[PDB]
Amino acid sequence: SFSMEKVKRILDAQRTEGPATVLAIGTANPPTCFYEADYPDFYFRVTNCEDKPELKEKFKRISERSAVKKRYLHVTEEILKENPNMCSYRAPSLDARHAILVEEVPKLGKEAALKAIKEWGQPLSKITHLIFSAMSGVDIPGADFRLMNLLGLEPSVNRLMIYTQGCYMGGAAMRHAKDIAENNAGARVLLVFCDLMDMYFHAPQNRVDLLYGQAVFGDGAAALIVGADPDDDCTERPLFQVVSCAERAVPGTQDYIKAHLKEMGMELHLSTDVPRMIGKNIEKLLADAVSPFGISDWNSLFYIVHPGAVAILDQVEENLGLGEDKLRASRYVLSEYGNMGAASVFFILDEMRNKSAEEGKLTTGEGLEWGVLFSFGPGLTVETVVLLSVPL
Amino acid sequence: SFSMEKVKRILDAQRTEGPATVLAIGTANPPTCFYEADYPDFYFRVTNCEDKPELKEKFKRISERSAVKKRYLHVTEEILKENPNMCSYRAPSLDARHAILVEEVPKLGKEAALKAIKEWGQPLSKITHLIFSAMSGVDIPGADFRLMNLLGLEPSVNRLMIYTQGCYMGGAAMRHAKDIAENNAGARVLLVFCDLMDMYFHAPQNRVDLLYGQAVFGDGAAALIVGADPDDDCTERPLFQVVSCAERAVPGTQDYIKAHLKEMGMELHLSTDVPRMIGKNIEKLLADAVSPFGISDWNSLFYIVHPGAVAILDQVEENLGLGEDKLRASRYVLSEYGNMGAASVFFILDEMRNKSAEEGKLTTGEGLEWGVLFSFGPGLTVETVVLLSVPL
């Protein structure tokens, strides 16, 4: 109990007062922009499948119904010519794909992170934690380690590296950031998502889910700084406050989304019933999250909804009975960027703060006080994050 | 500020008082035991390399100097005959290896977890968090998801899944568990490590690091329940208390440990200078960790030292000037199990509590009050965890 007195001193010192907050957001994308109208022509030519015109028409109809206008993609024609096995279905190409990703993932992560750090305005040495979430590029040491050296973070930065899990990771990694920030006084967390879909590129198949992915998956990186108790003696300023995080595996849906890391790259299996399943469950998930704060009117909230597909946003809008403009920011990111995996919701969060400032709203949350962020991934995992806006 | 009052109620409710504690530990291993004396004969026969007798003698000398007596290995002769490409160097075999691991990783994890849950003595429904750390078996959904269904945890369990990072993950995942447990009143974390080395099995090469791995890497799973503020109204009882966690990337050593996930499996590069590098840095790392508690005599601590190799334990013993019996528990696990990756330190922790009870020591830490746990991995990453024992 002499020792437990010493421990209690340490615990006392580390206490925080307020909730974890997002202090900054920065994003980045691969250079090459692919417009949806032209992608079918590009895709079927570069895979030498122009002799399958019926399949191409089936792909165009999916692309045209996608509500994606354009995407930034790491995979280019030059990369496909340098690595032809990426275009031959099931041919061994994992080594080529990883070679391409192992340097590019941390690199695009740095671009996003630098923008975040710039907004934040504090020295690199104040970053105590780094969380790196990446769909692809599995390597040892990981992208977190590479990013730490690219940025010049302290060698003592506490790191967490999470590979190859899926689109629920936005909400899930935010939960981990929240716990770090709130349990450690002074902690400032750099949270980075970098999702390059190169491993999911394959020659076109007669599979609705593969074609959808080929039409909708986009690339992007987002970085956030998360911390509790913003310091007034510096230019630190909260954008949103993280009130609560919840996660749920929807029973009976294990097989809805599966992806296997194989010699041919990533082998995907994705049910077309995912948007309906989400629509069936969304209201109960929302109610459990915001009922503790007395909220029962769904239209009084601002929304960040992971844009997995346009059907998903429609199902959320419909089953919550939202007004027609409620999901604007979510649809905007789907339109301008496509589905960029876990990074997507933070592109939306970024977009929302900017649109709000631009329109003269009184809060970063479209003028509203309370809001909710939703992430959806395998299998099926749903993240529900309650947010507070900040006044403007 | 109406809303911030509601938030402060939530924050007030979630506060904990004491440090995160390990409430239980359970371990498990693959069925087949391989004795070190016989492994060279097994290894070179089953890979059809008996026509390389000089290389075999070089391997035997490494095995004989390893201080490993036996290991439990998932890779068996039957598996190698069913998947011959595992025996042909650089031949494509990733798909075969993953098939073998995707079910086995969560399965061995369950065996360890069940033992942990049994010791703990509380219902499955009290587990609020699951952290799963696995060297191999990358799959979507992951082993955390599989384990949740195998065990029957609540669908709302908060999950974290960390693949393919290396032996620092023991200390690192403990840090994440500590933050969860201390920031969330009532949280009870199930922390599972399952490390199957199947991806590192290859035909013998004239490479000192590959041969070492082939001689020393073993398989195992360890599960812990971690929580703050043990409840007296139930049979919950702390074994150790987690005082502090620290992490450091040793400058100038990025290339010391590299491993690439490839079509042939895991491609390893490991410097023989790792044990010397650890020995050079260990004292400064220890001093920074326990100086805040006024500790300067290294022999007054109990030790859990990740047994990467016998040279590592020797370098730690020597550069801290430890008495000859200080690292007994660490050497014991290296001897009886080999290097089981991230799970290893918790086998040692388990072993230490048992030996202490058996010998009638007054604490779970060999009768001593303060202790330190060390993890070492890529590149180079060192974890330093300060522990408190519990009286017996």
Side-chain angles (χ1 to χ4, degrees), chain A residues 131-163:
Chain A
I131 299 168
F132 207 122
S133 164
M135 169 53 66
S136 293
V138 182
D139 201 39
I140 287 175
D144 64 314
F145 177 92
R146 303 294 174 207
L147 181 60
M148 167 194 70
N149 288 327
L150 288 176
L151 285 181
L153 307 183
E154 300 298 301
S156 59
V157 62
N158 292 305
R159 285 174 289 114
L160 173 53
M161 172 76 239
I162 310 160
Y163 280 110

Coordinates of all heavy atoms in Angstrom, one line a residue, chain A residues 131-163:
Chain A
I131 N -2.4 6.1 -34.4 CA -3.2 5.0 -34.9 C -3.3 5.0 -36.4 O -3.8 6.0 -37.0 CB -4.6 5.0 -34.3 CG1 -4.6 5.0 -32.7 CG2 -5.4 3.8 -34.9 CD1 -6.0 5.3 -32.1
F132 N -2.9 3.9 -37.0 CA -2.9 3.8 -38.5 C -3.8 2.7 -38.9 O -3.6 1.5 -38.5 CB -1.5 3.6 -39.0 CG -1.3 4.1 -40.5 CD1 -0.3 5.0 -40.8 CD2 -2.1 3.6 -41.5 CE1 -0.2 5.5 -42.1 CE2 -1.9 4.1 -42.8 CZ -1.0 5.0 -43.1
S133 N -4.8 3.0 -39.6 CA -5.8 2.0 -40.1 C -5.6 1.9 -41.7 O -5.7 2.9 -42.4 CB -7.2 2.4 -39.7 OG -8.2 1.7 -40.4
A134 N -5.4 0.7 -42.2 CA -5.1 0.6 -43.6 C -5.8 -0.7 -44.1 O -5.5 -1.8 -43.6 CB -3.7 0.6 -44.0
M135 N -6.6 -0.7 -45.2 CA -7.2 -1.9 -45.8 C -6.1 -2.8 -46.4 O -6.2 -4.0 -46.2 CB -8.2 -1.5 -46.9 CG -8.7 -2.6 -47.7 SD -9.4 -4.1 -46.8 CE -10.8 -3.3 -46.1
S136 N -5.1 -2.3 -47.0 CA -4.1 -3.1 -47.7 C -2.7 -2.6 -47.5 O -2.5 -1.4 -47.2 CB -4.4 -3.3 -49.2 OG -5.6 -4.0 -49.3
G137 N -1.7 -3.4 -47.8 CA -0.3 -3.1 -47.6 C 0.4 -3.7 -46.4 O 1.4 -3.2 -45.9
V138 N -0.2 -4.9 -46.0 CA 0.3 -5.6 -44.8 C 1.8 -5.8 -45.0 O 2.3 -6.4 -46.0 CB -0.3 -7.0 -44.7 CG1 0.2 -7.7 -43.4 CG2 -1.8 -6.9 -44.6
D139 N 2.6 -5.3 -44.0 CA 4.0 -5.4 -44.0 C 4.6 -5.2 -42.6 O 3.9 -4.6 -41.7 CB 4.6 -4.3 -44.9 CG 6.0 -4.6 -45.4 OD1 6.4 -5.7 -45.7 OD2 6.8 -3.6 -45.5
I140 N 5.8 -5.7 -42.3 CA 6.4 -5.6 -41.0 C 7.8 -5.0 -41.2 O 8.6 -5.6 -42.0 CB 6.5 -7.0 -40.3 CG1 5.1 -7.4 -39.8 CG2 7.5 -6.9 -39.2 CD1 5.2 -8.8 -39.2
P141 N 8.1 -3.9 -40.6 CA 7.2 -3.0 -39.8 C 6.1 -2.4 -40.6 O 6.3 -2.4 -41.9 CB 8.2 -1.9 -39.2 CG 9.6 -2.5 -39.4 CD 9.5 -3.3 -40.6
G142 N 5.1 -2.0 -40.0 CA 3.9 -1.5 -40.7 C 4.0 0.0 -41.1 O 4.9 0.7 -40.8
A143 N 2.9 0.4 -41.7 CA 2.7 1.8 -42.1 C 2.8 2.8 -41.0 O 3.1 4.0 -41.2 CB 1.3 2.0 -42.9
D144 N 2.4 2.4 -39.8 CA 2.5 3.3 -38.6 C 3.9 3.6 -38.4 O 4.3 4.8 -38.1 CB 1.8 2.6 -37.4 CG 2.6 1.4 -37.0 OD1 2.9 0.6 -37.8 OD2 2.9 1.3 -35.8
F145 N 4.8 2.6 -38.4 CA 6.2 2.8 -38.2 C 6.8 3.7 -39.4 O 7.5 4.6 -39.1 CB 6.9 1.4 -38.2 CG 8.4 1.5 -38.1 CD1 9.0 1.5 -36.8 CD2 9.2 1.6 -39.2 CE1 10.4 1.6 -36.7 CE2 10.6 1.8 -39.1 CZ 11.2 1.8 -37.8
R146 N 6.4 3.4 -40.6 CA 6.9 4.2 -41.7 C 6.4 5.6 -41.6 O 7.2 6.6 -41.8 CB 6.4 3.6 -43.1 CG 6.8 2.2 -43.4 CD 8.3 2.0 -43.5 NE 8.7 0.6 -43.6 CZ 9.9 0.1 -43.3 NH1 10.8 1.0 -42.8 NH2 10.2 -1.1 -43.4
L147 N 5.2 5.9 -41.2 CA 4.7 7.2 -41.0 C 5.4 8.0 -39.9 O 5.6 9.2 -40.1 CB 3.1 7.2 -40.8 CG 2.5 8.6 -40.6 CD1 2.7 9.4 -41.9 CD2 1.0 8.5 -40.3
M148 N 5.7 7.3 -38.8 CA 6.4 7.9 -37.7 C 7.8 8.5 -38.2 O 8.1 9.6 -37.8 CB 6.6 6.9 -36.6 CG 7.6 7.4 -35.5 SD 8.1 6.0 -34.4 CE 9.0 5.0 -35.5
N149 N 8.5 7.8 -39.0 CA 9.8 8.2 -39.6 C 9.6 9.3 -40.7 O 10.4 10.2 -40.8 CB 10.6 7.1 -40.1 CG 11.1 6.2 -38.9 OD1 11.5 6.7 -37.9 ND2 11.2 4.9 -39.2
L150 N 8.6 9.1 -41.5 CA 8.3 10.1 -42.6 C 8.0 11.5 -42.0 O 8.4 12.5 -42.5 CB 7.2 9.7 -43.5 CG 7.4 8.5 -44.4 CD1 6.1 8.2 -45.2 CD2 8.6 8.9 -45.4
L151 N 7.2 11.5 -40.9 CA 6.8 12.7 -40.2 C 7.9 13.3 -39.3 O 8.0 14.5 -39.0 CB 5.5 12.5 -39.4 CG 4.2 12.4 -40.2 CD1 3.1 12.2 -39.2 CD2 4.0 13.6 -41.1
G152 N 8.7 12.4 -38.7 CA 9.6 12.8 -37.7 C 9.0 12.9 -36.3 O 9.3 13.8 -35.5
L153 N 8.0 12.0 -36.0 CA 7.4 11.9 -34.6 C 8.5 11.5 -33.6 O 9.5 10.9 -34.0 CB 6.2 11.0 -34.6 CG 5.1 11.2 -35.6 CD1 3.9 10.2 -35.4 CD2 4.6 12.7 -35.6
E154 N 8.2 11.7 -32.3 CA 9.1 11.2 -31.3 C 9.2 9.7 -31.4 O 8.2 9.0 -31.6 CB 8.6 11.6 -29.9 CG 8.6 13.1 -29.7 CD 9.9 13.7 -29.8 OE1 10.8 13.4 -29.1 OE2 10.1 14.6 -30.7
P155 N 10.4 9.1 -31.1 CA 10.6 7.7 -31.1 C 9.7 7.0 -30.0 O 9.5 5.8 -30.1 CB 12.1 7.5 -30.9 CG 12.6 8.8 -30.3 CD 11.7 9.9 -30.9
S156 N 9.3 7.8 -29.1 CA 8.4 7.2 -28.0 C 6.9 7.3 -28.3 O 6.1 7.0 -27.4 CB 8.8 7.9 -26.7 OG 8.5 9.3 -26.8
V157 N 6.5 7.7 -29.5 CA 5.1 7.8 -29.8 C 4.5 6.4 -29.6 O 5.1 5.4 -30.0 CB 4.9 8.4 -31.2 CG1 5.5 7.4 -32.3 CG2 3.4 8.6 -31.6
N158 N 3.3 6.3 -29.0 CA 2.6 5.1 -28.8 C 1.8 4.7 -30.0 O 1.0 5.5 -30.4 CB 1.7 5.1 -27.6 CG 2.4 5.3 -26.2 OD1 3.2 4.5 -25.9 ND2 2.0 6.3 -25.5
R159 N 2.1 3.6 -30.6 CA 1.6 3.2 -31.9 C 0.6 2.0 -31.9 O 0.7 1.1 -31.0 CB 2.7 2.9 -32.9 CG 3.4 4.1 -33.4 CD 4.6 3.8 -34.3 NE 5.8 3.3 -33.5 CZ 6.2 2.0 -33.6 NH1 5.7 1.2 -34.5 NH2 7.3 1.6 -32.9
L160 N -0.4 2.1 -32.8 CA -1.3 1.0 -33.1 C -1.6 0.9 -34.6 O -1.9 2.0 -35.2 CB -2.7 1.3 -32.3 CG -3.8 0.4 -32.6 CD1 -3.5 -1.1 -32.4 CD2 -5.0 0.8 -31.7
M161 N -1.4 -0.3 -35.1 CA -1.4 -0.5 -36.5 C -2.5 -1.6 -36.8 O -2.3 -2.7 -36.3 CB -0.1 -0.9 -37.1 CG 0.0 -1.3 -38.6 SD -0.2 0.0 -39.7 CE -1.7 -0.4 -40.6
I162 N -3.5 -1.3 -37.6 CA -4.6 -2.2 -37.9 C -4.8 -2.3 -39.4 O -5.2 -1.4 -40.1 CB -5.9 -1.6 -37.2 CG1 -5.6 -1.3 -35.8 CG2 -7.0 -2.7 -37.3 CD1 -6.7 -0.3 -35.2
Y163 N -4.5 -3.5 -39.9 CA -4.6 -3.9 -41.3 C -5.8 -4.7 -41.7 O -6.2 -5.5 -40.9 CB -3.4 -4.7 -41.8 CG -2.1 -3.9 -42.1 CD1 -1.0 -4.0 -41.3 CD2 -2.0 -3.0 -43.2 CE1 0.2 -3.3 -41.5 CE2 -0.9 -2.3 -43.5 CZ 0.2 -2.4 -42.6 OH 1.3 -1.7 -42.9

